[PDB]
mmCIF file of all heavy atoms in Angstrom:
data_model
loop_
_atom_site.group_PDB
_atom_site.id
_atom_site.type_symbol
_atom_site.label_atom_id
_atom_site.label_comp_id
_atom_site.label_asym_id
_atom_site.label_seq_id
_atom_site.Cartn_x
_atom_site.Cartn_y
_atom_site.Cartn_z
ATOM 1 N N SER I 1 5.903 19.256 42.057
ATOM 2 C CA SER I 1 6.879 18.257 41.679
ATOM 3 C C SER I 1 6.693 17.701 40.266
ATOM 4 O O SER I 1 7.054 16.568 39.981
ATOM 5 C CB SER I 1 7.024 17.170 42.757
ATOM 6 O OG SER I 1 5.787 16.499 42.952
ATOM 7 N N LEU I 2 6.156 18.521 39.363
ATOM 8 C CA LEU I 2 6.205 18.167 37.942
ATOM 9 C C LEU I 2 6.956 19.199 37.121
ATOM 10 O O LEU I 2 7.004 20.393 37.467
ATOM 11 C CB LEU I 2 4.814 17.985 37.381
ATOM 12 C CG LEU I 2 3.950 16.963 38.038
ATOM 13 C CD1 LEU I 2 2.490 17.252 37.854
ATOM 14 C CD2 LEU I 2 4.351 15.488 37.635
ATOM 15 N N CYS I 3 7.549 18.723 36.029
ATOM 16 C CA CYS I 3 8.245 19.586 35.069
ATOM 17 C C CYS I 3 7.403 19.659 33.804
ATOM 18 O O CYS I 3 7.166 18.616 33.133
ATOM 19 C CB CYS I 3 9.612 19.036 34.712
ATOM 20 S SG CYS I 3 10.642 20.265 33.787
ATOM 21 N N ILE I 4 6.962 20.880 33.467
ATOM 22 C CA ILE I 4 6.207 21.089 32.208
ATOM 23 C C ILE I 4 7.077 21.784 31.174
ATOM 24 O O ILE I 4 7.565 22.913 31.404
ATOM 25 C CB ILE I 4 4.978 21.954 32.423
ATOM 26 C CG1 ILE I 4 4.105 21.304 33.459
ATOM 27 C CG2 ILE I 4 4.183 22.081 31.150
ATOM 28 C CD1 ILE I 4 2.923 22.072 33.814
ATOM 29 N N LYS I 5 7.205 21.137 30.019
ATOM 30 C CA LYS I 5 7.923 21.698 28.859
ATOM 31 C C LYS I 5 7.073 21.760 27.594
ATOM 32 O O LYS I 5 6.311 20.840 27.324
ATOM 33 C CB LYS I 5 9.109 20.813 28.502
ATOM 34 C CG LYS I 5 10.229 20.866 29.458
ATOM 35 C CD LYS I 5 11.247 19.815 29.145
ATOM 36 C CE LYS I 5 12.231 19.758 30.301
ATOM 37 N NZ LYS I 5 13.352 18.834 30.042
ATOM 38 N N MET I 6 7.292 22.805 26.787
ATOM 39 C CA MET I 6 6.642 22.962 25.482
ATOM 40 C C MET I 6 7.445 23.761 24.436
ATOM 41 O O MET I 6 8.092 24.769 24.735
ATOM 42 C CB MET I 6 5.141 23.432 25.585
ATOM 43 C CG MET I 6 4.827 24.795 26.214
ATOM 44 S SD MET I 6 3.483 25.753 25.334
ATOM 45 C CE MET I 6 4.447 26.569 24.059
ATOM 46 N N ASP I 7 7.423 23.295 23.201
ATOM 47 C CA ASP I 7 8.071 24.059 22.127
ATOM 48 C C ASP I 7 7.185 25.191 21.691
ATOM 49 O O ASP I 7 6.151 24.954 21.091
ATOM 50 C CB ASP I 7 8.387 23.154 20.930
ATOM 51 C CG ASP I 7 9.467 23.719 20.071
ATOM 52 O OD1 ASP I 7 9.578 24.964 20.121
ATOM 53 O OD2 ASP I 7 10.212 22.936 19.381
ATOM 54 N N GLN I 8 7.596 26.419 21.956
ATOM 55 C CA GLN I 8 6.834 27.585 21.476
ATOM 56 C C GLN I 8 6.758 27.778 19.948
ATOM 57 O O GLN I 8 5.943 28.558 19.502
ATOM 58 C CB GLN I 8 7.391 28.874 22.058
ATOM 59 C CG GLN I 8 6.751 29.261 23.332
ATOM 60 C CD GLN I 8 7.485 30.317 24.085
ATOM 61 O OE1 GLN I 8 6.871 31.253 24.560
ATOM 62 N NE2 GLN I 8 8.800 30.151 24.256
ATOM 63 N N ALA I 9 7.593 27.081 19.170
ATOM 64 C CA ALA I 9 7.700 27.313 17.727
ATOM 65 C C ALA I 9 6.656 26.514 16.918
ATOM 66 O O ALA I 9 6.505 26.671 15.676
ATOM 67 C CB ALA I 9 9.137 26.983 17.248
ATOM 68 N N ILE I 10 5.932 25.646 17.612
ATOM 69 C CA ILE I 10 4.927 24.835 16.944
ATOM 70 C C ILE I 10 3.637 25.645 16.810
ATOM 71 O O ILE I 10 3.128 26.174 17.773
ATOM 72 C CB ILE I 10 4.719 23.477 17.683
ATOM 73 C CG1 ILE I 10 6.048 22.738 17.827
ATOM 74 C CG2 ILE I 10 3.814 22.601 16.880
ATOM 75 C CD1 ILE I 10 6.628 22.179 16.431
ATOM 76 N N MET I 11 3.121 25.757 15.597
ATOM 77 C CA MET I 11 2.018 26.699 15.278
ATOM 78 C C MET I 11 1.048 25.963 14.399
ATOM 79 O O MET I 11 1.463 25.207 13.534
ATOM 80 C CB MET I 11 2.538 27.897 14.496
ATOM 81 C CG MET I 11 2.911 29.191 15.281
ATOM 82 S SD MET I 11 3.360 30.539 14.083
ATOM 83 C CE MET I 11 2.478 31.990 14.726
ATOM 84 N N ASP I 12 -0.240 26.119 14.661
ATOM 85 C CA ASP I 12 -1.240 25.669 13.716
ATOM 86 C C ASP I 12 -1.177 24.194 13.387
ATOM 87 O O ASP I 12 -1.523 23.780 12.269
ATOM 88 C CB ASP I 12 -1.110 26.486 12.426
ATOM 89 C CG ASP I 12 -1.313 27.962 12.666
ATOM 90 O OD1 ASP I 12 -2.448 28.323 13.038
ATOM 91 O OD2 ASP I 12 -0.345 28.755 12.525
ATOM 92 N N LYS I 13 -0.715 23.402 14.339
ATOM 93 C CA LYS I 13 -0.756 21.950 14.164
ATOM 94 C C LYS I 13 -1.777 21.231 15.044
ATOM 95 O O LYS I 13 -2.178 21.679 16.130
ATOM 96 C CB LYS I 13 0.619 21.307 14.329
ATOM 97 C CG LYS I 13 1.726 21.878 13.464
ATOM 98 C CD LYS I 13 1.536 21.718 11.912
ATOM 99 C CE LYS I 13 2.290 20.493 11.368
ATOM 100 N NZ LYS I 13 3.221 19.976 12.422
ATOM 101 N N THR I 14 -2.183 20.088 14.553
ATOM 102 C CA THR I 14 -2.932 19.141 15.315
ATOM 103 C C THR I 14 -1.926 18.453 16.254
ATOM 104 O O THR I 14 -0.785 18.173 15.861
ATOM 105 C CB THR I 14 -3.567 18.210 14.301
ATOM 106 O OG1 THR I 14 -4.949 18.042 14.575
ATOM 107 C CG2 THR I 14 -2.905 16.927 14.225
ATOM 108 N N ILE I 15 -2.328 18.218 17.502
ATOM 109 C CA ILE I 15 -1.447 17.617 18.516
ATOM 110 C C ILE I 15 -2.187 16.697 19.471
ATOM 111 O O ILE I 15 -3.301 17.020 19.965
ATOM 112 C CB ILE I 15 -0.698 18.674 19.359
ATOM 113 C CG1 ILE I 15 0.269 19.489 18.496
ATOM 114 C CG2 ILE I 15 0.152 18.020 20.440
ATOM 115 C CD1 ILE I 15 0.793 20.763 19.219
ATOM 116 N N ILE I 16 -1.561 15.543 19.749
ATOM 117 C CA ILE I 16 -2.107 14.582 20.707
ATOM 118 C C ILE I 16 -1.215 14.420 21.921
ATOM 119 O O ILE I 16 0.005 14.352 21.773
ATOM 120 C CB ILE I 16 -2.397 13.238 20.060
ATOM 121 C CG1 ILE I 16 -3.027 12.285 21.084
ATOM 122 C CG2 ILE I 16 -1.197 12.644 19.480
ATOM 123 C CD1 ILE I 16 -3.951 11.214 20.463
ATOM 124 N N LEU I 17 -1.820 14.401 23.119
ATOM 125 C CA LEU I 17 -1.111 14.060 24.349
ATOM 126 C C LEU I 17 -1.226 12.565 24.674
ATOM 127 O O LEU I 17 -2.339 12.038 24.711
ATOM 128 C CB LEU I 17 -1.632 14.855 25.519
ATOM 129 C CG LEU I 17 -1.811 16.368 25.356
ATOM 130 C CD1 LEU I 17 -2.184 16.911 26.722
ATOM 131 C CD2 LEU I 17 -0.504 17.006 24.886
ATOM 132 N N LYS I 18 -0.082 11.892 24.893
ATOM 133 C CA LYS I 18 -0.053 10.488 25.281
ATOM 134 C C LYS I 18 0.729 10.329 26.623
ATOM 135 O O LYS I 18 1.701 11.017 26.875
ATOM 136 C CB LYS I 18 0.606 9.637 24.211
ATOM 137 C CG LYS I 18 0.115 9.852 22.762
ATOM 138 C CD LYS I 18 0.904 8.965 21.835
ATOM 139 C CE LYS I 18 0.300 8.845 20.438
ATOM 140 N NZ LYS I 18 1.384 8.295 19.531
ATOM 141 N N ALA I 19 0.321 9.398 27.452
ATOM 142 C CA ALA I 19 0.915 9.286 28.754
ATOM 143 C C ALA I 19 1.107 7.837 29.111
ATOM 144 O O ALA I 19 0.357 6.957 28.609
ATOM 145 C CB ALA I 19 0.038 9.985 29.814
ATOM 146 N N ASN I 20 2.149 7.591 29.906
ATOM 147 C CA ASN I 20 2.266 6.316 30.641
ATOM 148 C C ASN I 20 2.198 6.583 32.114
ATOM 149 O O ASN I 20 2.898 7.496 32.636
ATOM 150 C CB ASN I 20 3.557 5.547 30.299
ATOM 151 C CG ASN I 20 3.584 5.114 28.880
ATOM 152 O OD1 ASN I 20 2.718 5.529 28.036
ATOM 153 N ND2 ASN I 20 4.548 4.275 28.565
ATOM 154 N N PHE I 21 1.378 5.792 32.793
ATOM 155 C CA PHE I 21 1.103 6.047 34.185
ATOM 156 C C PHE I 21 0.385 4.874 34.803
ATOM 157 O O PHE I 21 -0.159 4.015 34.098
ATOM 158 C CB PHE I 21 0.236 7.309 34.342
ATOM 159 C CG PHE I 21 -1.062 7.255 33.597
ATOM 160 C CD1 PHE I 21 -2.229 6.889 34.235
ATOM 161 C CD2 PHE I 21 -1.114 7.568 32.249
ATOM 162 C CE1 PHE I 21 -3.411 6.871 33.564
ATOM 163 C CE2 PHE I 21 -2.327 7.527 31.541
ATOM 164 C CZ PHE I 21 -3.467 7.190 32.193
ATOM 165 N N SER I 22 0.389 4.812 36.129
ATOM 166 C CA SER I 22 -0.363 3.746 36.728
ATOM 167 C C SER I 22 -1.705 4.305 37.130
ATOM 168 O O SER I 22 -1.856 5.478 37.275
ATOM 169 C CB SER I 22 0.395 3.131 37.923
ATOM 170 O OG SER I 22 0.723 4.146 38.848
ATOM 171 N N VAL I 23 -2.633 3.405 37.383
ATOM 172 C CA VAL I 23 -4.000 3.666 37.704
ATOM 173 C C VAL I 23 -4.387 2.714 38.860
ATOM 174 O O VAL I 23 -3.984 1.542 38.907
ATOM 175 C CB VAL I 23 -4.832 3.267 36.475
ATOM 176 C CG1 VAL I 23 -6.066 2.471 36.849
ATOM 177 C CG2 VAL I 23 -5.156 4.448 35.555
ATOM 178 N N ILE I 24 -5.160 3.207 39.814
ATOM 179 C CA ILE I 24 -5.798 2.309 40.710
ATOM 180 C C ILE I 24 -7.266 2.638 40.624
ATOM 181 O O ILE I 24 -7.681 3.794 40.886
ATOM 182 C CB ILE I 24 -5.317 2.437 42.171
ATOM 183 C CG1 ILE I 24 -3.789 2.406 42.210
ATOM 184 C CG2 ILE I 24 -5.991 1.351 43.011
ATOM 185 C CD1 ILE I 24 -3.166 1.490 43.214
ATOM 186 N N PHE I 25 -8.016 1.643 40.207
ATOM 187 C CA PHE I 25 -9.418 1.757 39.964
ATOM 188 C C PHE I 25 -9.772 2.712 38.870
ATOM 189 O O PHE I 25 -9.798 2.363 37.731
ATOM 190 C CB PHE I 25 -10.163 2.161 41.208
ATOM 191 C CG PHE I 25 -11.623 1.979 41.092
ATOM 192 C CD1 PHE I 25 -12.130 0.795 40.710
ATOM 193 C CD2 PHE I 25 -12.485 2.992 41.352
ATOM 194 C CE1 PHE I 25 -13.432 0.631 40.599
ATOM 195 C CE2 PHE I 25 -13.798 2.813 41.236
ATOM 196 C CZ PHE I 25 -14.268 1.642 40.857
ATOM 197 N N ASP I 26 -10.084 3.920 39.258
ATOM 198 C CA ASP I 26 -10.668 4.854 38.343
ATOM 199 C C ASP I 26 -9.851 6.114 38.124
ATOM 200 O O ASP I 26 -10.364 7.054 37.518
ATOM 201 C CB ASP I 26 -12.059 5.251 38.832
ATOM 202 C CG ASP I 26 -12.042 5.939 40.225
ATOM 203 O OD1 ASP I 26 -10.937 6.245 40.747
ATOM 204 O OD2 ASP I 26 -13.141 6.162 40.804
ATOM 205 N N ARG I 27 -8.612 6.164 38.619
ATOM 206 C CA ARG I 27 -7.785 7.361 38.454
ATOM 207 C C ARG I 27 -6.298 7.099 38.452
ATOM 208 O O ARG I 27 -5.809 6.155 39.070
ATOM 209 C CB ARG I 27 -8.125 8.450 39.481
ATOM 210 C CG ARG I 27 -7.402 8.356 40.848
ATOM 211 C CD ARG I 27 -7.808 7.131 41.685
ATOM 212 N NE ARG I 27 -6.600 6.403 42.082
ATOM 213 C CZ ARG I 27 -6.040 6.444 43.287
ATOM 214 N NH1 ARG I 27 -6.581 7.157 44.264
ATOM 215 N NH2 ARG I 27 -4.932 5.754 43.507
#
Protein backbone atom coordinates (compact mmCIF):
# COMPACT_ATOMS: atom_id res chain seq x y z
CA SER A 1 0.00 0.00 0.00
CA LEU A 2 2.75 2.47 -0.88
CA CYS A 3 3.43 4.28 -4.15
CA ILE A 4 7.12 4.68 -5.05
CA LYS A 5 8.09 7.23 -7.72
CA MET A 6 11.47 8.40 -9.08
CA ASP A 7 12.80 10.55 -11.93
CA GLN A 8 15.16 8.39 -13.96
CA ALA A 9 16.73 11.49 -15.64
CA ILE A 10 18.49 12.68 -12.49
CA MET A 11 22.20 11.73 -12.70
CA ASP A 12 25.23 12.41 -10.58
CA LYS A 13 23.49 14.59 -8.04
CA THR A 14 23.54 14.82 -4.31
CA ILE A 15 20.04 14.00 -2.95
CA ILE A 16 18.27 14.15 0.42
CA LEU A 17 15.16 12.23 1.51
CA LYS A 18 12.74 14.16 3.79
CA ALA A 19 9.55 12.78 5.33
CA ASN A 20 6.52 13.76 7.34
CA PHE A 21 5.13 11.05 9.50
CA SER A 22 3.96 10.21 12.94
CA VAL A 23 6.01 8.38 15.52
CA ILE A 24 5.09 6.52 18.65
CA PHE A 25 8.03 6.20 20.93
CA ASP A 26 10.86 4.98 18.86
CA ARG A 27 9.44 4.28 15.39
